[PDB]
Amino acid sequence: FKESPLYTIALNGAFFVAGVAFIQSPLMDMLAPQL
Amino acid sequence: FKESPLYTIALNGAFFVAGVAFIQSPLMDMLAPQL
Amino acid sequence: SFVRNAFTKSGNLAWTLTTTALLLGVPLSLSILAEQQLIEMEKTFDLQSD
Amino acid sequence: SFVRNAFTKSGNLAWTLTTTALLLGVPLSLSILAEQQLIEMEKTFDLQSD
Amino acid sequence: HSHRQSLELVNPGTVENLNKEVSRDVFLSQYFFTGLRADLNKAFSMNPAFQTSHTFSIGSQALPKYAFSALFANDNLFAQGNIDNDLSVSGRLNYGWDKKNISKVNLQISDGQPTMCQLEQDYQASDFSVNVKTLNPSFSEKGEFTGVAVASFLQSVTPQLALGLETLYSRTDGSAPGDAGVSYLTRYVSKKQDWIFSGQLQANGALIASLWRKVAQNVEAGIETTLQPTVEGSTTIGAKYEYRQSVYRGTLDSNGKVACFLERKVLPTLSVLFCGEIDHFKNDTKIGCGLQFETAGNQELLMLQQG
Amino acid sequence: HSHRQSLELVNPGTVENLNKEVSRDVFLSQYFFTGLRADLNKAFSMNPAFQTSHTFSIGSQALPKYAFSALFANDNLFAQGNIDNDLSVSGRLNYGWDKKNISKVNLQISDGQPTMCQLEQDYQASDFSVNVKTLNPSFSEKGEFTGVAVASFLQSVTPQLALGLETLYSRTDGSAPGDAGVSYLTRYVSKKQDWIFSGQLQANGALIASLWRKVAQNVEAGIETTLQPTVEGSTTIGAKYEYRQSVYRGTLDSNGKVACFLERKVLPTLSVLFCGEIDHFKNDTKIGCGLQFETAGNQELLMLQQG
Amino acid sequence: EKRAHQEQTEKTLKQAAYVAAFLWVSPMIWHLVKKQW
Amino acid sequence: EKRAHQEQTEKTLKQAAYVAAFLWVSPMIWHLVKKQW
Amino acid sequence: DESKERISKILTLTHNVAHYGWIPFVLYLGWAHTSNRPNFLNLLSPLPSV
Amino acid sequence: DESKERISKILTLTHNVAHYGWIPFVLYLGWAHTSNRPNFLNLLSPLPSV
Ligand SMILES: CCCCCCCCCCCCO[C@@H]1O[C@H](CO)[C@@H](O[C@H]2O[C@H](CO)[C@@H](O)[C@H](O)[C@H]2O)[C@H](O)[C@H]1O
Ligand SMILES: CCCCCCCCCCCCO[C@@H]1O[C@H](CO)[C@@H](O[C@H]2O[C@H](CO)[C@@H](O)[C@H](O)[C@H]2O)[C@H](O)[C@H]1O
């Protein structure tokens, strides 16, 4: 239990890393229609 | 200068008669596309 | 002066009439246009069939 | 009981995911579909020309 | 009662179907909403109709967030049951003893408000129409009625006119004797069914007069005028332009507000729809947007649906 | 400065064009609006572009009710003048002394608030970019500066990277000596221009880091992360799927809100557009809907426009 | 005092019933009037 | 007291100028570092 | 009276059965009068999963 | 000083000329650099009236 400013820092950093891996990964390509 | 209840009575009656004549008249037909 | 009031009044009225006409006519215009296109497509498919 | 809380939680989450998916996907689905139809029309006009 | 058969009188519509053309078909007050909404109805069968509907909404006060409704309708019985978030269950049940006579029930439970259910009996003869609907009936210890009762009658004096009335008697508790309010009713259908007039002078002093006109097969128009000392009344003129792909409805009010409702069928299944309302006197807007999916439940209806 | 010519360095984009792909092209924060809006732009000529635009809005706080804007753009000079209801006039003027160097002016008058005008000078060399923008300059009686000054620099250490900074010095009145805030800047473009990274550590302690990726020619994606003791930050991931008939943009925020913007070209002239934003944490919605007409002014452009 | 209000509402309902009966009679009377001219 | 704040902001601006000069120098230094390996 | 208690009791019973059990009864009528008689998952799922 | 009064005066003049006269000047530049040179009504009317 922290609920301190480093909490939102770490949470937004985690969302960032997750989104970058989602974007950079093959899964994002699947979201692109072939046409 | 009245600004009495018969004012809104007369005003809505006037809008009614005007709308009925607009509707019943040829002008409403023109608003209908031929197709 | 009175002329300055007339511009304000007429411009506000033109604004109301214009936005009203847009909201009431543009969706209808697109509805009618889509229906025209559909009638045209049906006519083309009819002439090609016959 | 705990089971009654689980239904509430899961149902609210399903609601959020569903409405999110609708808003994000249905306009896109219709965009993609219109584009598919347009590609199809172009292909038909191409084969008829040749 | 022989030269009654001579007149060739025609049954008039129900008292509920009096302003049907203007208030419901043409205008958009029933149809209009606010905020985003999505509807998902799926049909499992069609000889006896059965279908289940989900409804998701957000951005309005009237519509709930999730609502699951399911109806069954065979040749003479209709039953709809509806469940809403916060568990407000509404159920209606029509049973047709005959094509003319119907006996129906509407039951609504609000999980925190008094339950309200109404028993109605609607009988339509060759040349008149009756209904009797009783809301929350109950008998005091003395044997006296306690509830609301609405009995209405409508008769065709001539094949175009239909004059009638509705009597409302309401007794809340029994301590105060209940009050009675009478309302009179008039309909006039044209000779060629082109235009209709409909006027009702309610029991509260109010007057509602409406006109409907059919310009062509794809287009319709209608005006309505309501008014209720402290008098106040609103006039609304509107038009409905229906086509095969779409249905357009426009409305212009005496309160200074304009309104639009477009239902655009885009797929054989999906239908998008838009609704927009401007108010000029206080210069603001209500936008609602939404959609309807209809999906077949079984394989046969799924092939019927597309082609 | 010879094996400088050896490196084959490429000019980086302006400091304003740093997060251009994520913040503007992909995301919809600039594009998003509320309520109904209509835009009517008409183009009178095209070799030197000249066009006049009307904009009607209702249902939002940012956008005014009527706005008339007109721009002229010849080979090296751009001038736009804008008049708004309640007579707030905004005018911008770019003049290109050369393809690289530009000198520009932005002047805004609010008819009740202090006038704000900024003089900017943006010079981009072979391997770096400079700008100097001064907002409301003025000299006190002592000869000391009074206003805001922002000087930024950006250099490509290698053909993919671009490191730089921007220095803001602001002195309001002269009684208190003005304050200085420095911010650092980083961009990294991929080898095949597939993906871009962009990070700026502002002077207020804030950090903004963003990534852009091009999955295919018709599709793009991007994430952004802002944060500013009292810390608070928002992350947003979004995608842009552009086609010939339409442009779709979707966005998913860490504050629990989702957003959508569709610009659907329907005619060669008309283009409808929709925007919808849900917020789940407080369960409500913003809908904006609108349109754009573009019309040719002269006959030749009118025939060019359709075909 | 409440007896007077009960009597008044009862009178109103009886009147409504009489009006409904008159309306049921009305087509015949209307046609007989048209028959006279 | 305001003289100290003026000195501090002046120091900040001088520092920023020095950083910009270092960045201008930086491509050559980077390439010489790459040249070393 | 005892009759008052009895009518109140059976009204409580009927109200409960209608609140808890109206819409499942509608769904059972449906599931009876279909030729396919789908399962309970498909009966509530909005999809065309058939 | 007198120079302060002078600079303030010409700044007032320039601010007035820019507030009242920026957007008509833009429109005049346009109307000059067109081949057709339309009238003032068409220059402001949103229609394709040409
Ligand atoms: C709680 C959830 C809320 C969900 C809210 C989602 C609301 C979305 C509404 C706006 C969506 C845009 O929907 C828009 O509808 C129009 C009709 O007007 C469709 O237009 C359609 O008609 C043409 C006519 O030839 C067909 O080719 C095709 O079926 C389709 O393009 C567009 O494809 C779509 O862009
Ligand atoms: C202040 C004024 C405010 C004015 C507000 C008006 C806003 C109106 C927006 C909703 C209007 C509905 O607009 C809807 O757009 C869709 C695209 O999505 C159009 O869809 C279009 O695409 C198809 C694709 O084949 C074409 O055949 C055709 O050009 C057209 O149908 C529909 O014809 C129209 O029904």
Curated annotation (Swiss-Prot), chains C, D:
The chain crosses the membrane at residues 13-34. It comes from the Eukaryota. Coiled coil: none annotated. It is found in: Mitochondrion outer membrane. Central component of the TOM (translocase of outer membrane) receptor complex responsible for the recognition and translocation of cytosolically synthesized mitochondrial preproteins. Together with TOM20 and TOM70 functions as the transit peptide receptor at the surface of the mitochondrion outer membrane and facilitates the movement of preproteins into the TOM40 translocation pore. Docks TOM20 and TOM70 for interaction with the general TOM40 import pore (GIP) complex. May regulate the TOM machinery organization, stability and channel gating. Belongs to the Tom22 family. Forms part of the preprotein translocase complex of the outer mitochondrial membrane (TOM complex) which consists of at least 7 different proteins (TOM5, TOM6, TOM7, TOM20, TOM22, TOM40 and TOM70). Interacts with TOM20 and TOM70. Interacts with FCJ1. Present with 6610 molecules/cell in log phase SD medium. Its cytoplasmic domain associates with the cytoplasmic domains of TOM20 and TOM70. Its intermembrane space domain provides a trans binding site for presequences and the single membrane anchor is required for a stable interaction between the GIP complex proteins. This is Mitochondrial import receptor subunit TOM22. The gene is TOM22.
Curated annotation (Swiss-Prot), chains E, F:
Forms part of the preprotein translocase complex of the outer mitochondrial membrane (TOM complex) which consists of at least 7 different proteins (TOM5, TOM6, TOM7, TOM20, TOM22, TOM40 and TOM70). Interacts with mitochondrial targeting sequences. Interacts with FCJ1. It comes from the Eukaryota. Channel-forming protein essential for import of protein precursors into mitochondria. Keywords: Ion transport, Membrane, Mitochondrion, Mitochondrion outer membrane, Porin, Protein transport, Transmembrane, Transmembrane beta strand, Transport. GO terms for biological process: monoatomic ion transport; protein import into mitochondrial matrix; protein insertion into mitochondrial outer membrane. The lineage of its organism: Eukaryota, Fungi, Dikarya, Ascomycota, Saccharomycotina. Belongs to the Tom40 family. The chain holds residues 49 to 373 of 387 of the full protein. GO terms for cellular component: cytosol; mitochondrial intermembrane space; mitochondrial outer membrane; mitochondrial outer membrane translocase complex; mitochondrion; pore complex. GO terms for molecular function: porin activity; protein transmembrane transporter activity. It is a multi-pass membrane protein. It is found in: Mitochondrion outer membrane. This is Mitochondrial import receptor subunit TOM40.
Curated annotation (Swiss-Prot), chains G, H:
GO terms for biological process: mitochondrial outer membrane translocase complex assembly; protein insertion into mitochondrial outer membrane; protein targeting to mitochondrion; protein transmembrane transport. Keywords: Membrane, Mitochondrion, Mitochondrion outer membrane, Protein transport, Signal-anchor, Transmembrane, Transmembrane helix, Transport. The keyword Membrane applies. It is a single-pass membrane protein. One of its GO terms (cellular component) is mitochondrial outer membrane translocase complex. This is Mitochondrial import receptor subunit TOM5. The chain crosses the membrane at residues 15-33. Forms part of the TOM (translocase of outer membrane) complex that consists of at least 7 different proteins (TOM5, TOM6, TOM7, TOM20, TOM22, TOM40 and TOM70). Its main location: mitochondrion. The gene is TOM5. It comes from Saccharomyces cerevisiae (strain ATCC 204508 / S288c) (Baker's yeast). Belongs to the Tom5 family. It is found in: Mitochondrion outer membrane. The keyword Cytoplasm does not apply. The lineage of its organism: Eukaryota, Fungi, Dikarya, Ascomycota, Saccharomycotina. Component of the TOM (translocase of outer membrane) receptor complex responsible for the recognition and translocation of cytosolically synthesized mitochondrial preproteins. TOM5 is involved in insertion of preproteins into the TOM40 translocation pore.
From Swiss-Prot, chains I, J:
Keywords: Membrane, Mitochondrion, Mitochondrion outer membrane, Protein transport, Transmembrane, Transmembrane helix, Transport. This is Mitochondrial import receptor subunit TOM7. Residues 32-50 are mitochondrial intermembrane. GO terms for cellular component: mitochondrial outer membrane; mitochondrial outer membrane translocase complex; mitochondrion. The lineage of its organism: Eukaryota, Fungi, Dikarya, Ascomycota, Saccharomycotina. The chain crosses the membrane at residues 10-31. Present with 3250 molecules/cell in log phase SD medium. Component of the TOM (translocase of outer membrane) receptor complex responsible for the recognition and translocation of cytosolically synthesized mitochondrial preproteins. TOM7 is involved in assembly and stability of the TOM complex. GO terms for biological process: protein import into mitochondrial matrix; protein insertion into mitochondrial outer membrane. Belongs to the Tom7 family. It comes from Saccharomyces cerevisiae (strain ATCC 204508 / S288c). Forms part of the preprotein translocase complex of the outer mitochondrial membrane (TOM complex) which consists of at least 7 different proteins (TOM5, TOM6, TOM7, TOM20, TOM22, TOM40 and TOM70).
